[PDB]
């Protein structure tokens, strides 16, 4: 009949998904963006006077990438000149516009090439980082006070993360934290002095005669890590003549004995800062809780307020130890930690009592703690219907742990089983974001007794477009192995017919704590392959997968490249038994870690897979970075785990690629998984006389995300699959 979801569609983005990106500026109001004008909305009723006219900056003289209003309500920060660096890092330019006097602030402006700017959480105080140094701006139109003086490009970082900390521990460039009322500014300092550099060519525009060598501090597994220091400064007692004292918090002694990280910093009260440290062996983590000493002017990290979080069967936390949530007085906190049963749940801690009390339990896990009031703790979890791929909002009554309510489960069960939530400032209102299996739906609620105020975005437009196009359907379900359920999804072509045999693509990640089998509604390349090309795209969450407890997640501890790949092969066989699957036509592909799994599967000699694609794969663990690799693999030394580092490379599997058709893709400017890794793969396959397909993407990093390269690659991959399959 009518038209399908085509490749063009995915690349040219013809079927747009609507969102409702709001930002709460108080407990009663938010701003909704546009392409035109920031408007302000009243949560109770829905009325909305325009916040600031779209005309304000047509004759500003620059494209303005981003906006950011001070909490005072008195100023807008204006981001422009944005120059992307890593995943989160970038530089930019900045002007401050005073809402009151409808007037740009021109003197003492924030310098260009600024790495990071942040308001204080109450007033209009500014902290910005520039050339690796921290600067504070008490009033927007007044001068800046320098705070640190040791900023050195590529060497000493003040208030910002180095490459590895950005990627692997904080997930952010920022490494400064204001105190709740803005007296204190706490910051981290990282030292890359002795860290080796990864170096690679960047070619740029045709006009550049000589390729430039980019070089970045980057610790590969086992190499010299960056050192970290931590400080706090009073932003009220700085003068402009005395340079300014930063107070160092040190230790703790359980970390100073050897290599360590700082992995969490969370303010508690005006004068309590909580810090989490984690040993290089990411087995053992400590929480410190330090009060300010009015008297001495230094910070007391009182012994006996410290909290050990360890693991006997793996690493601490999902990717890092969880974040604590402090009650208003700051004398107790909730954080997610692993059960005695293996499951991640909420513990109630009293700041000077080591024995925490679990407030939630069960064979399911808590994803994140969303909000804390005086009577209710708010959280996302996968409890509903026993589906680890579902997400819902719950509240637990702080005075009776038996009384927990689902706030999202029932609003629309057929449409909505994957939720996320955004709360107003004292949590009197919340936006719920449903994201599947039906169309994304955005709605507004008031907390007083969880009354549904109104629908913010229903995507009815998209719904109207998508009824004249033959969409694929999705199936979530589980298969059993060794008395355990393992979840898996399948994207099914339209008019699916279980009496016909279909080609199957296995879409894999399989990295530690991953989940490819869930309820989110996704409009992507798989949608095209199923709808236009009649392929079954399938993903499977085997051992090492997350959100189902530690017996699963920790099965691959110290053993990457074993069960997770044994399980993906396992999945394939199982689907090929299902009757609707032509086993002469199973393929497999993955990006990143998924590339690694794919490669490792193709090299296994399973005989299951006719062909496969690996995009920007890891090829041996020693090439990837310290913080990530070590988390799961330990150190690549004889005394520790060198042996399995060695025994788990793609290269050693070279000879078995004779049995398969392989496509190896990689961007030359990958700062994350260096091209080196695909370079060693090809060298291996050349060395043992195996033919394969390749494609470098010049100057593209780990996302190969540019407009045209994104289109080129997907076009290229479609061609390879279609040929493997027709």
Ligand X SMILES: CS(=O)(=O)c1cccc(-c2cc(N3CC[C@H](c4cc(F)c(F)cc4F)[C@@H](N)C3)ncn2)c1
Q: Which residues bind a copy of itself (CB under 8 A)?
A: 196-201, 203, 206, 209-213, 220, 222-223, 620, 622-623, 649, 651, 668, 674-676, 679-680, 682-691, 693-699, 708-709, 711-712, 715-716, 719
| Alpha-carbon separation of residue 180 from 158, 177, 186, 411, 568 (angstroms) | 21, 9, 11, 35, 47
Closest contact distance (angstroms) between CB of 88 and ligand X is: 10
Distance CA 167, CA 320 (A): 12
Nearer to a copy of itself, 562 or 676 (CB): 676
Answer yes or no whether residue 319 interacts with ligand X by CB under 6 A: yes
Residue 435: CB partners within 8 Å, gap ≥ 6? Answer: 418, 419, 420, 519, 520, 521
Nearer to ligand X, 133 or 167 (CB): 167
SS3 255: helix
Cα angle: 64, vertex 68, 69; to 5 degrees: 130
**Residue 710: active-site member:** no
Provide φ and ψ at 640, rounded to 5°.
Answer: -105, -100
Answer yes or no whether residue 615 interacts with ligand X by CB under 6 A: no
Which one-letter DSSP state was computed for residue 113? S
Nearer to ligand X, 439 or 618 (CB): 618
Given the residues 9, 670, 671, 701, the one annotated as active site: 670
Nearer to a copy of itself, 234 or 711 (CB): 711
673, 684, 717, 724: residue in contact with ligand X (rule CB under 6 A): 673
Q: Which does 466 bind (CB under 5 to 8 A by kind): ligand X, a copy of itself, none?
A: none
Residue 139: CB partners within 8 Å, gap ≥ 6? Answer: 124
CA-closest candidate to residue 621, choices 599, 589, 588, 590: 599
Q: Which does 501 bind (CB under 5 to 8 A by kind): a copy of itself, ligand X, none?
A: none
CA-closest candidate to residue 498, choices 415, 564, 581, 587: 581
How many residues bind ligand X (CB under 6 A)? The answer is 15
Longest Cα–Cα distance in the chain: 82
Tokens of residue 283, six digits: 């087995």
> What character string, x for contact with ligand X (CB under 6 A) and - otherwise, covers 509-548?
--x-------------------------------------
Which one-letter DSSP state was computed for residue 437? B
Answer yes or no whether residue 647 interacts with ligand X by CB under 6 A: no
Nearer to a copy of itself, 229 or 716 (CB): 716
Answer yes or no whether residue 591 interacts with ligand X by CB under 6 A: no
Strand-pairing partners, residue 454, are: 444
Tokens of residue 162, six digits: 């180095």
Question: What DSSP string runs through 555-566?
Answer: GGTT-TTSHHHH
Question: What DSSP string runs through 210-250?
Answer: S-EEEEEE--BTTSPPPEEEEEEEESSS--SSS--PPEEE-
Nearer to ligand X, 263 or 724 (CB): 263
What is the torsional sign of CA 447, 450, 451, 454?
A: positive
Nearer to a copy of itself, 601 or 685 (CB): 685
Distance CA 429, CA 448 (A): 8
> What character string, x for contact with ligand X (CB under 6 A) and - otherwise, covers 555-584?
------------------------------
Closest contact distance (angstroms) between CB of 642 and ligand X is: 19
Q: Which does 606 bind (CB under 5 to 8 A by kind): ligand X, a copy of itself, none?
A: none
Please say whether the beta carbons of 265 and 326 come within 8 A.
Answer: no
What is the torsional sign of CA 185, 191, 197, 199?
A: positive
Please say whether the beta carbons of 428 and 24 come within 8 A.
Answer: no
Please say whether the beta carbons of 179 and 95 come within 8 A.
Answer: no
CA-closest candidate to residue 382, choices 343, 326, 329: 343
Answer yes or no whether residue 614 interacts with ligand X by CB under 6 A: no
Nearer to a copy of itself, 103 or 647 (CB): 647
9, 95, 133, 167: residue in contact with ligand X (rule CB under 6 A): 167
Nearer to a copy of itself, 84 or 658 (CB): 658
Cα angle: 74, vertex 80, 86; to 5 degrees: 115
Closest contact distance (angstroms) between CB of 701 and ligand X is: 10
**Residue 702: active-site member:** yes
Which one-letter DSSP state was computed for residue 482? T
Tokens 């192995």 locate to: 481
Which one-letter DSSP state was computed for residue 655? G
Closest contact distance (angstroms) between CB of 201 and ligand X is: 19
Q: Which does 643 bind (CB under 5 to 8 A by kind): ligand X, a copy of itself, none?
A: none
Q: Which does 673 bind (CB under 5 to 8 A by kind): a copy of itself, ligand X, none?
A: ligand X
525, 672, 681, 701: residue in contact with ligand X (rule CB under 6 A): 672
Q: Which does 620 bind (CB under 5 to 8 A by kind): ligand X, a copy of itself, none?
A: a copy of itself
Q: Which does 559 bind (CB under 5 to 8 A by kind): ligand X, a copy of itself, none?
A: none
Q: Which does 200 bind (CB under 5 to 8 A by kind): a copy of itself, ligand X, none?
A: a copy of itself
Given the residues 274, 514, 539, 592, the one annotated as active site: 592
Closest contact distance (angstroms) between CB of 354 and ligand X is: 25
Tokens of residue 387, six digits: 């589906």
> What character string, x for contact with ligand X (CB under 6 A) and - otherwise, covers 116-155?
----------------------------------------
Answer yes or no whether residue 628 interacts with ligand X by CB under 6 A: yes
Closest contact distance (angstroms) between CB of 61 and ligand X is: 36
Nearer to a copy of itself, 197 or 308 (CB): 197
Closest contact distance (angstroms) between CB of 389 and ligand X is: 16
Tokens of residue 106, six digits: 């021109």
592, 606, 641, 678: residue in contact with ligand X (rule CB under 6 A): 592
Tokens 């980019």 locate to: 214
Distance CA 293, CA 302 (A): 11
Q: Nearest-CB residue to ligand X?
A: 593
Q: Which spans of this chain sit near ligand X (rule: CB under 6 A)?
A: 167-169, 171, 319-320, 511, 592-593, 618, 624, 628, 672-673, 702
> Catalytic amino acids?
592, 670, 702
């Amino acid at each position: 009949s009518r038209k399908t979801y085509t490749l063009t569609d995915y690349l040219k983005n013809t079927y747009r998904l609507k969102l409702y990106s709001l930002r709460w500026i108080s407990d009663h109001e938010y701003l909704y963006k546009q392409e035109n004008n920031i408007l302000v909305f009243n949560a109770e009723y829905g009325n909305s006077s325009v916040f600031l006219e779209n005309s304000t900056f047509d004759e500003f003289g620059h494209s303005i990438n981003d906006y950011s209003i001070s909490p005072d309500g008195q100023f807008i920060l204006l981001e422009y000149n944005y120059v992307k660096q890593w995943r989160h890092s970038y530089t930019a330019s900045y002007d401050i516009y005073d809402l009151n006097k409808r007037q740009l602030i021109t003197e003492e402006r924030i310098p260009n090439n600024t790495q990071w700017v942040t308001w204080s959480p109450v007033g209009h105080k500014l902290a910005y980082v520039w050339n690796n140094d921290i600067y504070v701006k008490i009033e927007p139109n007044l001068p800046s006070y320098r705070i640190t003086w040791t900023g050195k490009e590529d060497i000493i970082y003040n208030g910002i993360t180095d490459w590895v900390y950005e990627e692997e521990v904080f997930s952010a460039y920022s490494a400064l934290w204001w105190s709740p009322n803005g007296t204190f500014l706490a910051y981290a300092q990282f030292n890359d002095t002795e860290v080796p550099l990864i170096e690679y060519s960047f070619y740029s525009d045709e006009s550049l005669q000589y390729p430039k060598t980019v070089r970045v501090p980057y610790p590969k597994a086992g190499a010299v890590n960056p050192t970290v220091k931590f400080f706090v400064v009073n932003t009220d007692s700085l003068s402009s003549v005395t340079n300014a004292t930063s107070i160092q918090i040190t230790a703790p002694a359980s970390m100073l004995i050897g290599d360590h990280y700082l992995c969490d910093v969370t303010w508690a009260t005006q004068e309590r800062i909580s810090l989490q440290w984690l040993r290089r062996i990411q087995n053992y983590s400590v929480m410190d809780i330090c009060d300010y000493d009015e008297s001495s002017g230094r910070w007391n990290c009182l012994v006996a307020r410290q909290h050990i979080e360890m693991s006997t069967t793996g690493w601490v936390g999902r990717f890092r130890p969880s974040e604590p949530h402090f009650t208003l007085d700051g004398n107790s906190f909730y954080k997610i930690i692993s059960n005695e049963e293996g499951y991640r749940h909420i513990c109630y801690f009293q700041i000077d009592k080591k024995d925490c009390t679990f407030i939630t339990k069960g064979t399911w896990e808590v994803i994140g703690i969303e909000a804390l009031t005086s009577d209710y703790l708010y959280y996302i979890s996968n409890e509903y219907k026993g589906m680890p791929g579902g997400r819902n909002l719950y509240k637990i009554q702080l005075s009776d742990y038996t009384k927990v309510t689902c706030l999202s489960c029932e609003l629309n069960p057929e449409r909505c089983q994957y939720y996320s939530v955004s709360f107003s400032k004292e949590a009197k209102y919340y936006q719920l974001r449903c994201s599947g299996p039906g169309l994304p739906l955005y709605t507004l609620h008031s907390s007083v007794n969880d009354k549904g105020l109104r629908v913010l975005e229903d995507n009815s437009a998209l719904d109207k477009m998508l009824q004249n196009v033959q969409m694929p359907s999705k199936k979530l379900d589980f298969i059993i192995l060794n008395e355990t359920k393992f979840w898996y999804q399948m994207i099914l072509p339209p008019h699916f017919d279980k009496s016909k045999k279909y080609p199957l693509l296995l879409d894999v990640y399989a990295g530690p704590c991953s989940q490819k089998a869930d309820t989110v509604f996704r409009l992507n390349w798989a949608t095209y392959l199923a709808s236009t090309e009649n392929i079954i795209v399938a993903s499977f969450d085997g051992r090492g997968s997350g959100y189902q407890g530690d017996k699963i997640m920790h099965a691959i501890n110290r053993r990457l490249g074993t069960f997770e790949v044994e399980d993906q092969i396992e999945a394939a066989r199982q689907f090929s038994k299902m009757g609707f699957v032509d086993n002469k036509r199973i393929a497999i592909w993955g990006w990143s870690y998924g590339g690694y799994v794919t490669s490792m599967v193709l090299g296994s000699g399973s005989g299951v897979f006719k062909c496969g694609i690996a995009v920007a794969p890891v090829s041996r663990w020693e090439y990837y970075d310290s913080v990530y690799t070590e988390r799961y693999m330990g150190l690549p030394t004889p005394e520790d785990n060198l042996d399995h580092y060695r025994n788990s490379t793609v290269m050693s599997r070279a000879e078995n690629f004779k049995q398969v058709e392989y496509l190896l893709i990689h961007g030359t400017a990958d700062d994350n998984v260096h091209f080196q890794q695909s370079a060693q793969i090809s060298k291996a396959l050349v060395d043992v006389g195996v033919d394969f397909q390749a494609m470098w993407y010049t100057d593209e990093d780990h996302g190969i995300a540019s407009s045209t390269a994104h289109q080129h690659i997907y076009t290229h991959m479609s061609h390879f699959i279609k040929q493997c399959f027709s």
